[PDB]
Every structure is written in C-alpha cells, then in structure tokens.
Design a protein around this nucleic acid. Structure first.
Lengths: 470, 436, 436, 470
RNA sequence: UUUUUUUUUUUUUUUUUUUUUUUUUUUUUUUUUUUUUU
RNA sequence: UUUUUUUUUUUUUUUUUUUUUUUUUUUUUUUUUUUUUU
C-alpha cells in the first residue's frame, strides 16, 4: 500500500512546516525575512549541529574553538528600511531539541533530519564539487558526475544511504582502506570489528545500487579480501569507471527550501488529509505558488541564481542541460559561464553591497524521477535451458550444451577482478552514445494530475553541450 | 495383469467425465461454453481448494482475506450474442464435495485429484517456470529443464510423486534444509520426527527416480548426515548438476482438459468396457475427434496458443522441439518468439477485447512415453570422491550418443504397435531448447 | 590500600543500621521486639522481594497468587504482656524503596543487598541442605558439604559470586545443561547467546575458585564443547568429586543479624571513623556486647538454638565441629542429635506455645577467615586423561596432612594479631561431621 | 487439592449406581433379586467381556466355541415362590456399550472398569490362589501372599497397576522371559520393540512399588541385560523372596458389590455433593446400612460366607487374621477349616438344593488403608557429610572419609545381583518377627468422622495363627 | 501390481526480480572563496 | 583494588522424598471344583 507512506511523509513535512512557523514566531522576523533562504540555511546547520549526537559527544570532551560550549555560528540576516545587517546570534542546542520534540508530537523526527541533510548535500553538489579530495585519493577529476550526496555523513539512515552516489561510496571506502594501510588497524579488537561491519554495510548498499550482474559479482568478490591493501584500490577504481557507464540505480529525493514548507503549512494546506508524495507532482505544484526571496551580490545576476536554486531544489545539477531547459522552458546556462558565486555568504563580506530580490521557480512541465537506470546493456548469457528431458520415447539424440556444462563444473568457484574487467571492456565497447533510454515514459504537463498523456520531446539543436562542468 | 489397471483408470475417467456432465447441467452453460478451457480451469482450482483438507483446516482457524468462509474466486466466463462477460460466482466447497461423492459411486476419487493437480502442474510448467525461487535458493537459472511438477504440493500420493522432477525435489529439500538452518528445528519433538520422516520419504523417492548406481549411493550417503547444514547444500547441488546429464527416470502422465473427458463421456464412449490407458494411444485418439474453444487476446495469435495447449496436454514443454514438430507435422515455435501470453486471464483484463476461437490438437503421429532414460547411460568417505566419477562420466558423455534404440514413432492407423518409421533430422541447428 | 575498603564497608553498614533504626521507629515496636531475629528475617525477605527487579518485572505481567499486587507476607511478631501474637501486615515495595534511597544518602545500596542475601544463604545452609535437588540431578547425597551459598540466585554480583560453593555452581550448570538437552535451546537467537554468556561467566568464576592447575585446565577444556550433552555431565561430576578434596578457594563473608547492626549504630558507634572490616576481629567484638532475643518452641531448647545461630552468623556449619567448639569454648552438638527445628516459624504454628528467650553469642577466642585452601595441596585430549592425575593426587592425599601452617587461634584481648596459641585435640573420634 | 478427586470418584460411582438401577429396570427383577451378588457378578463379567476390545478384536477373527458371535454366558438367577432357577440369557455387547455411554453422560467410563476388574481380582484372591501357575513357573508355593491382583490383565491403567502385587508382576515377567527363551522373539521387528516397551513399563511400575534403595538399584541393574536368559530368572526370584520381607508399597483399592452402589444411588444419596473417598470411612459407612442376599449350598454355612464376602469387599484376605477379627469384633476363621466353597456357582450344580440368605457386613471399627510399608529396615549408609570446608583459618587437619572416597571413584560403576544379595541377606538377618510397625496410627470408632482419637489394640492371645493359608 | 496426513502471516493485477523498508560514538580540521597549498 | 541484567506455571503448612496422576491389538485355552493332569 502507498497511502500509509503518503500519510507518514505528510505528517513529517507538516511537522517541519510547523517548526518553521514557530521559528518565525520566536525570531520576531518580518514576512519578507521569513522567505529568505539564508535564514533557513543557517537554522538548518543549527539543526544538524543539534542532532549530531556523535559530534556532540566528541565536542563535550573537546572544549576548543574558544567560545563553543553549546552554540555555533548563527548569522541571522535582517532588514532595516531596505538595507541589510547580519547578527551573530548564538543559540544553544537543547531548547531547540525540545522545540523539535514538541513540533513532531513527542517524536524525534530523525527522518526529517535525513531529508534536510540530503537537501544540504543536494545544494552542495549543485554549487561546488571537490576534485580536491578526488585527487587527494588520486582518482582523476573526470568523474565529478558521481559526487552526488558526497557531503552526507554516515549518520544518515537507509533513506539517506539510497541517494548517496556511487562515487561517494568509493571515496568513503578508499578513506577507510588508506587508514587501514597507514596503520595496522584491522586487529581483533572492537574497533576493527566495527569498521569491518560498517564496511560490509556500505558494500551491500553498493551492490544494491548496481543493476547488472557482472558488477554485483565483482563487488561480491572484492569482499573476499580480508586484508584490503593496494590491489583493491585499483579494483574499485575500475568499478567506478565501469559505473561511469554502467550507472547505479541511485534515487533523487526531492527536498525543498526550509521556507517553502513553512509557507505551505501556514496557509492551512494540511498534507496528511490530501496525501503527499516525494517523487510525484507534489514538490512541483508547491513551487508553482511559492514566493522566495534571496540575497545577491552587486555583481551577481538573479537570472542564473534562480536556475541554480532550481538545481539545488530538484537535484538536477548532474543531469543533461537540455532536459532541464525543456522542463524550465528557458535555456539553462552551464557552470562554465555562470557569472554568479555560491549561495552561502562568506563571513567577511560587507553588507552595503548586498541586495535582496525574488527567485523564479516556475517550470512549464513536470516529470517523474525514478531510481532506475538506462536500457542498453542487454547481450551476454541469455537465460535459457542447458539440458533436455525425453517426453516421447523416440530414438533421438539428447542435446546437451557441453561447453557450459564444463563451465558450471569447472573445479572450485568462478569470477575474478581482471577476468570480469574483460566483460567490462566488452560492454563498454558495445555501449554507444546513441542508445535512447527511458522507453515508455515522457514529460507531462502541469494541468494533468493522474499521468494521463505525455508529450515526447525531441532536440536537434546540434551540440549546445550536455555537460554542466567544463 | 494390466486389465485391472485399465478398468480402474477407465472407471476413474468415466466418473470425471460424468462430473463434467453434471457441472454443465448445473451451470446452465451453452454447448460452446462447455468447450472452454477457462471454465474447466477455474472449476478445477475449485476442486483442489475443496479437497485441500490441510488448507481447509488451516483456513478455518485463520479467517482472513475478507469474505472467505468457504468460497474462493470463481470467474465464470459467459457469452452474450458474441461478446463475453465474467461473473465472480462463489461456490462453497461442501456441496461439490457431495457431488463428487455421488459422481464416483460413493468414493472419494483422490486419484483423479492427483491427475488433475498434475495436469495443472503440467500447464504451469508449460507456461511459466520460476527462476525466481531457483535463485532465491541461489541455484543458477541454467536448470529450468528440471522444474517438472514444481507446482505440485506434498499432498499428492505416489502417482503424483512419480511425475515430480528431480529439480522439484531438490528445491523442496533445500527449503527444509534452510528452515532447519534458520532455527534449531530438529529437536526430539514430534515436529522434528515428522519432518525427518518426510525427509526420508522424499529421499527414497529421489533414489528410486535415478538409474545409475553412483548417484544412488551418494544419495544414500547424504542421508547419513543427521544434521543437515551447509555442506549438504552444495552436495545436493552437485547431485542436481549431475542429474542434468544423468537424468532420473521420471514419468510423464498424460492428462487432458476437463472438457475433453466430458465430451467423450457424454457421447457414450464408456471407457470401462473397451479399457483405457494413460501411456498408450488413448489420449491421442480422444484428441483426434475433440473440439476445444479458447479465449485469446486481440494481440495473441491462436496458432501458437494451440501448440502451447498441446504442450500443456502432453507435457512436452521440456522435450526437444524437433521431435514435437515431427509428431505435430508442423514447426513448433520456441518460447523465445511466442507472441502469446499465459493461458489464464488476469483478474483486471477488460472483456471488449477478448475473442474466442478454436484450438488445433490433431497430430500426424503418436508415440509411447515411458518413464525410462536415454540409452547413453547404458552405453557409458564423502561426496567428493563420487563427484570424481561424476566428472569422468560427464567427460565420457557426448552430445552425439543416440538413445531409445529399438523404439520408434508410429502412425495413427495402427493400434497394436506393429511397424514404426525411423525419423531423421539434418536441419542444422534450428534449436532444441524451449527456453532461450 | 585497605583504608578505602574499610571506609566503604563502614558507610554501608552504617546505612544498614540507620535503616534498622528507622524501621524500629516506623513499626512502633518495643525495645525487646527490636531485638528479635524473626522480625529482621521477615523484613529482609521484604527487602529482597523489593529489589528483585527481575521478579518484579515477571510478577507485574503475572498477576496470580490472589492478593499479590505489590505486597507479600509480613508476619510481624508482637508482645502483649508476656504472650505473643503474629499479624500479617502487608507492605508495598515502593515506599521501602525510597526509604532505602534516603537511608544510603541517595544511593541504591546493592552491595548491602548482596550481603543480606548471602547471610540468608548462610542461615539456609546452616539449617537445611537439599539432597532433594542434589538427587533430582542424580548426584549422590555424600557432597552436602559443597552446598554453600546454594540459595543465592544469579542476581548477586561478584561479591556474592565469591562465596557461592563449588557444588552450588555445579548444580546451577547442570540445570542449564539439562534444560539445553530437553529442548534445542542453543540456537543462534539472543536467548542462546545470553545463556552462553552466563555460562562462560559462571565457568571463569569456577576456574577462579580453584587452586591447582590440573582442575583449572580440565575446566578450560570442558568449555571447548560447544554442545553440552551427556558426557560433560559426568565430566563435571568428576570435577565435583575431585573438588571434594581439591577444594576451591571460596570466601566466607561474615554477616550478622539485622538487629546487631542496628543496636550498634543506635548507640553511636560510627563505623566510618574507626574503620570496619568483614574478615578481621570486627564481627566478633560487635557480638561481644550484643543482646539478641529469639522465639523458641515448647520442646526446643535454647542451648542448641544459640549454637545454631552462631553457625548462621559466622557460616561455620560446614566446618569441623572440634574447631568451632574450641572458639566457642563449649561443645558444639552435631545435627544428628539437635533437639531443635528450623529458626523460621511455620505459618500454621500456634502462638500459646511459643516462648521468647535470650541467645548466647559470646566466644572465648577469635580467628581470621581467609579465602584460602588447606596446605595439603601445597604439600602435594579429553577429561579422563586428567582424571588419571586426579586419582593419583587423591591417592597421595592423606587424612593426616596438617594445614594452615603459620596461623593460629587468637585471644580477644589482642587487637593487632600479635601472639596466637596453638590448639591441639587428642579427643579420639568425637566426630568432625555436622551431618550424619 | 483433594476435592476434585472426590468429585470425580463420586461422579463415577454415581454413574455406576445409575447403571445398576437401569439394569434392574431392564431385567424385570424383584427387589430381593436386585440384592444378589451372583447377578452382579455375571453382569460384570458381561461388562469386562464388552470392554475387552483386544479380546473383541481377537474373537471377531476367531469364530469358535460354537454359538459365540457377540454373546457369552449369562446365568441369571431368579426366584419362583421361594425356589430358584437359572436361565442362560445371552446379551450382546453393543447395546450395553451404548447403555454405559448414556450412563456416564457420554463418556466411556474406563476408570470404573478398572475398579470393577480390580474388585473381581480381589474376590478371586480371596477365594482361590493359583499355586498351579506358581509351580508351573517353578517358584515355590510359599509365596501365595504376593498373588494380589493376579487375575488382572494388562489392559488396566495406572490405577489398576498400583494394586497388582509384586508376585503378580514377577509371574507376568517370567512368562515373557520364558516366551523369549523358547523362541528368538526379541528381533528388531515391531513385536520385539513393543514387548520391550511393555517390559520397561512393568519394570518401572515394579521399582515404583518398592521402598528401600537396594532393591530399586538391583531392579535397575536387572534392566541392563538386553537378552533376558536364565540368570535373570533366579535374579528376580531372589528379588521376590527379598520382597517377602522388604515388601513393596502396594495400594488396597476398596471396591464394593455391584448392588451396594446401586442401592445407595437409588435412595438418593448423591456422592458428588457430599464428596466420596476410596480410602477413608466411605466404603465402611455405606456397608453399615447395606442389605445383601446371597446363594448358599445346603452344606455351606452363611457365617463363614459373610466373612469371606467381607474379605472380598475390603481385600483383607492377605492380612493378619487377628486384625481383621478386631475390626469385625468376631473371630475370623482361617481358610484351613472353612466349611464353605467358592462364591461363584458351577454351571452343573442343581437348583433344588440352593438356598438364599442374608450376609453380615457390619464391623465394629474402621481403619485407614494406606499404600505404605512397615518401619524396621533402617541401618546402612546413614546420609551424612564426607568432606569438610575450612571456615576459620586454624592450623588443623582436614578430615576426609577416605574409604568411601575410593568407593565413589572405584573405577566404572557399582551394583550387582549377588553383591546386593549380600545386603539382602544382612537385612533379612537384621529383620525380626517382633518389630512393631505403623507407629502413630490406630484403629478408630465408627461414630467419629474426622479422625480425632483412636484406640490402641493389644493382642496377647498366644498363637491363634496369623496365616490365612495353612 | 503399487497407493488421501495437519502444525503460529503469502499471492490469479503479468513473462526471468522487488520485495513496505529504517537514529551508533571512539586520541587535532574548516563557512575568509570556484578545481590546490597545506 | 575489584563490581545491580529481564525472558511462556513453583512453594514459608516441616528435617533427607512425593510431587494431581491416566483405555493399546498381534497365529489354539477354560466358570464341570479347593493346591495337579494335561
């Protein structure tokens, strides 16, 4: 059943919106100031810093960074008669802990935490990607497309684990492998057992993420190494560059600004009654009647800022630019010529230059965002019979597929790293930049609610560039 | 003597046909509607749901699935002036229990039950095979050929046990082994004793099914493990992949549609007098003058549907395609390019698109279907030592060894197995593989 | 350092004595009634029934035994002008929980709980030993001497675990082994893991209790059996009958009546300041100026009752009678001819016959009670190979080997263990055996 | 609790009495004829022949003995104006089966069957004992005292098994041993397994019956012989002659004539309400107001017949004659000079000589009949310590009882047949014909109901003879 | 001439996947900024 | 200087027993009668 999931997510987002309402009440902010992305961003880093129970425990025993008992940051932006001023207001965690507890009807609301931290990961992926760490591990900077959910820490649950990219897992596992190579950390102690456990948990997340059997089997084989040394490093680099084309089925969770939920809840649009969805039309239509204000530099233009905000909201920064333009209806400028900077404001930037203005989020069309992959790799061992059974008593031969009969019996087991790299190469050669994907699905219009009739897009606009970076 | 067996099976099928006659009388169906496979299929799931005494006892204590006191399903298809309509008519078990009791002259007729449930297993094997469960147990999907009688539950008797495939038994035993591994279920209690008993019963069924001494001995030694753990899992997987070539002597019971028997009985062809057989010419000649109507989708073609129905009737879906074509006289299309779907109709499919038409069951020739193995086998401490002889026998095996010496395909006009004709195919590599 | 342990035990017993003072205040009992053992006994079963959190949780889900929400028993004995009357006054646990919490300065005082439950175990061992269970497990009734701390449940900590006898652990482990033999209880579930854990905890307690390397090694090897069946049963019976002579180093915790502590605390003798000890002179000198009243049957004599009470207080019921007589200065009658019964009074006994009188606890001498073994041990693939060395050590053992060299019995007037006097008994065979 | 057992036995005897009422109704017998022991005796052999399901199955496949489809015997005695006549009326089993089924409220009433068959065993033991079979097995005729419950077949349950004597079990086991010696009957077949099972069931019944540990252990040891040959024969004969003095705790079930229950039930004395007991005062007071008529030969005297009937009712034929006389208040004549014959009438005896008269069952006193033994054997291994533990740290010896320490360790196990016969002989020598038993219990008066105050009997009447046979 | 046993929740939307899927903590990092520098 | 874990019904009439204890069938016997006879 899907009604229960819809009711649960509706209750969750209703609690989130009511917490936004109460923060607006408590902060004594104006109507316009309640529609600013920066305030929600700072408040949500406060949120994560209050539920980072692991870091809370680590910092209680580590009283450093000067005045840091329980309070961090808090750069609240406020309006005086047109001008803007930032105040470093410090909030302790504990009162906000209870205000959450009262906001979700006595519950912890950790799922909502996962969605906000994923949405921060989405905005981070949209704005800046780290080839710095990608080459710190030595991997080439060609794979920036697989840094989805990179900023997400381990503390997130299965829902958070679903949206993390393959390359994010590759980076996380190489970090552990390099740490275990630097020092003899895999001893029989509890630390070794726990890092082992986290390792197989991340690995079965990986093998769940993939779709074709060959990569799943080679990930299974990679596990057989009890002592991760150097060979597994290139093994999993080969895994990553195979996933470049043999991409994993990674979900795309549609989270929206802290305000958008608050404005919707304030108007009385209860999500529990009519139901809510995270993949369907829902986050699209809530943005159809949403007003958002944002802060812009004197050199920054708002036209690219709105498009980057739409990137961050719908996590489409790693998609084809042409498709995003089609849903937008307007051309989406790649990051090469974006005359804008990061959404977040540096702590040293002055305030006389800063100017607030609206953001455009309206899109002409809407589409479903499933956690599926492209259809192209379909040529190997077609599932079929190997033996036959005599039904009629007729003097005839019994056809046996002998060369596979030896293959099943071989000797011990089967499957290797380079052996399977051979089929990786074969499949890559079979792959073409022409294979059309997502057959049977199309882009839909806003006026339709039940997915009745789509329109098939068709682009012949040469080589405008389907590459957000470079 | 063979006359007594023939008389018994003739009486049984006569009772079955008379029950078909009475259901036709009671359902107020027309002559054409009495020749529909779907009606017989639904009625026979009603049959199994009425004699599933174990499930009856389990569901009486488990009142779930909404309105389910005694009645399940019942999608009866009916004609209005060319068009078709399904009615969800619910029948309770008990009245049909007594109608059976009166249909077999006061007897339970459990053997007939076994043949109908086997025929459902035959149609299921013909239509869809489950690599889903085959890989749920982790076994590779290369052995779909040994899923014969897979849908058959344990409740069937020895006659039902004869036709179940080796792979079906492998799946059933691995299920029990995994259940005993998940929890400490082999205690000295009655449950452990009874599952133990069922285990040796299934195992001596297995060792009866095989023919060569080596596999019988290794099955004997697999029994010596009082605690089935993980090693026996690969042991019996090796047994299965050895039976891939060293196939077991599994019977092929020739059951026919619920209607075919009813039409034959209605015409007055008493089977007790002239005798009946389940392996010989009998089910062939009854189909020589049988008319069958069936329901077909607007995209489905009837040409492949008739061949699939012949598969289901004669359980030849696991045989060589070339031989089935020879008896048919027409080419039999493998499942790779069958532009058809399952015979059974989904509960949500609309009725304006559905169209009824005849099915062809005539075959140019007839052949005996014995429960023997290929002549190639006659030409040829732990489990691994015997695995060595398994490997050497597999190496000795060739894809050239001709089997079934001294037997041939026969013509319809002959009744006493007088003179056959030797077939000979040189048509390259058309493909002797129904799947793939 | 030993000062911290002395301060801790002094604080603990001071809290216990202050709780006794407050119960005397709250119960409105007279001065004489505050010196009765029966009242303290009933109050301390109330104590254990209030901290038996496991049983509290088990009984909250199990509302049986009629009126048993939170209150059990409570047979308070009171005096009217010489005569005696029992009232079944029921006290709930929770208020006494907070009165404890206020009695130990906001602490739970679980250690004191361990000492009171051990002292109940000491009195139980002094009064009655169960050959009933000893033969329920089938072990012979010759080993009644190793039933020390038998009544102690698992809930006690390491201090409680120290005083439990070897035979008590043998009984507890055989109970678990028989339970695991009756049903397949060692599955991979959490229950099996937890019983496994309790098993190695009890086993390393066992191997800590022993002194010679051979028995420690054979206990180590008994662990190697992942599935405890029947062989381990006789293996650990052999372990027990080896510990009959190769005794384990089991402590003897010197706990005293609930009143004795209360009278001492009431007089103002703070134990924190001057320090307190559980093994040294301390419990001896507190009894040198302690007055105790007790209830006696019209047929029971008080002379044997006082000696049995001294047994219960100092846990000397399993020691040689001659030594206990030497410290007493008077002959100690063995249980064979004790014309007395159990200290506790049956729920049906009438009250007109019951008579209260003093008890004598004065002893002429005092001695240290260490958790060591006899000096005789220092003078000296499977389980059977080590059983061979067990047999040869038993043969090397003699009933003549004198133990405890370098230590002696001391006089009361000395406080710092200056000069002892060596005892010497030549009084034939008076009988060094409390039972039989 | 004892109330439930009392209610169950009361319901059972109420059903029995109501069945007696209905048989009196159906047989068209007079009031006097309903108080005849012979009619109840014949009817109860009909009862056992109707529930002997094993024999029913054996005789259905064995149609012999002429006219014997379902009907056996049935010598009903009737009065014509003073004279007596027997009619061989044949009743089939099945209708009486349903009349029972309706008499116990839809139940089978097998327990009542056990009590009636035990009461037949009691009367048989009172009247005639078989030294014929006792010497057929070769055992001497000195042990006629242990033939209690000898006629009881195996079909009885645990309640029936409790009252069977030790010698009865000895005879039953020797029969099986001789059968297994004559032919190789202990094969691995089902028959051998089932006779094995019956063997250990009879043996743990035996070891439950005994009281002293030595005989229990030697019975345990006798079991260790997987192939019962000749040695076990003398082994169990030694067991029997040891039980001659070391008697087993065998119960004495107090069943009464078929009529006595019927007369009590007919008068309206419901046993369910006031409760009923099988060991206490109950069967005594029901006989205090019971009238019984019986058939007597022209040479037989009724005075000894009444005493023999009291023997049969209370199963006191194996007790001391002096005690039975004390409860009677009149001298009880031993079987040596009883000028009477068996209660049952031979099939050929004429009817002109037969005369009916009353029977006396009144007793001056009453006593409890427990399933306990005599107190005398109490001198062997007095349960006591073997080791000591040092409580005080004193320089002293550690007393160890070494000769028993070797005995526990010995080598393998311990206990034999002749080895234990040695302690049998020692105990027999310690036994005396003077040891008084049953201390703390006494004979009671009729007027008391709650066992308040007894009177101690004392006999100094020389050697009148405490031996019913000889 | 070879045979009707029952043990705690499954399945006809469909033909080779999906299963209604989840808050763990170990010795110093990061919002001056967008692909280097430590 | 060595430590509070919980898994389906027990126990203070009392000191070494008792445990509220149960319808299985395998090849020919027995009521002339009470200790022989086959």
């Amino acid at each position: 059943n899907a009604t229960e999931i819809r009711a649960s997510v509706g209750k969750m987002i209703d609690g989130i919106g009511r917490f936004y309402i109460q923060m607006c009440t408590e902060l004594k902010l104006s109507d316009y100031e309640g529609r600013l992305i920066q305030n929600s961003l700072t408040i949500e880093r406060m949120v994560l810093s209050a539920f980072d129970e692991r870091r809370n425990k680590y910092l209680e025993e580590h009283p450093s960074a000067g005045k840091d008992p329980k309070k961090t940051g808090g750069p609240i932006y406020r309006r005086v008669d047109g001008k803007w001023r930032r105040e470093l207001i410090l909030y302790d965690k504990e009162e906000i802990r209870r205000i959450w507890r009262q906001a979700n009807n006595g519950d912890d609301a950790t799922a909502g935490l996962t969605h906000m931290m994923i949405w921060h990961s989405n905005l981070n992926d949209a704005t800046y990607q780290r080839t710095r760490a990608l080459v710190r591990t030595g991997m080439d900077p060609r794979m920036c497309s697989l840094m989805q959910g990179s900023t997400l820490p381990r503390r997130s649950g299965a829902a958070g684990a679903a949206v993390k990219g393959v390359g994010t897992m590759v980076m996380e596992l190489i970090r552990m492998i390099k740490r275990g190579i630097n020092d003899r950390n895999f001893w029989r102690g509890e630390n070794g057992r726990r890092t082992r456990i986290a390792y197989e948990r991340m690995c079965n997340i990986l093998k769940g993420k993939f779709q074709t059997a060959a990569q799943r089997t080679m990930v299974d084989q990679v596990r057989e190494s009890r002592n991760p040394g150097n060979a597994e490093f290139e093994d999993l680099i080969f895994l990553a560059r195979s996933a470049l084309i043999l991409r994993g089925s990674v979900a795309h969770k549609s989270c929206l600004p802290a305000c958008v939920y608050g404005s919707a809840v304030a108007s009385g649009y209860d999500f529990e009654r009519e139901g809510y969805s995270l993949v369907g039309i829902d986050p699209f239509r809530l943005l159809q009647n949403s007003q958002v204000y944002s802060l812009i530099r004197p050199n920054e233009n708002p036209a690219h800022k709105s498009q980057l905000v739409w990137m961050a909201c719908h996590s489409a920064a790693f998609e084809d630019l042409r498709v995003s333009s089609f849903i937008r209806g307007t051309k989406v400028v790649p990051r090469g010529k974006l005359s804008t900077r990061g959404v977040q404001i540096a702590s040293n930037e002055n305030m006389e230059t800063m100017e607030s203005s609206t953001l455009e989020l309206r899109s002409r069309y809407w589409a479903i965002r499933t956690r599926s992959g492209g259809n192209t790799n379909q040529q190997r061992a077609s599932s079929g019979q190997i033996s036959i059974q005599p039904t009629f008593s007729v003097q005839r031969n019994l056809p046996f597929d002998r060369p596979t009969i030896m293959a099943a019996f071989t000797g011990n087991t089967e499957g290797r790293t380079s052996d399977m790299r051979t089929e990786i190469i074969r499949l890559m050669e079979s792959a073409r930049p022409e294979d059309v994907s997502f057959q049977g699905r199309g882009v839909f219009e806003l006026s339709d609610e039940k997915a009745t009739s789509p329109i098939v897009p068709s682009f012949d606009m040469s080589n405008e560039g389907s590459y957000f970076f470079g």
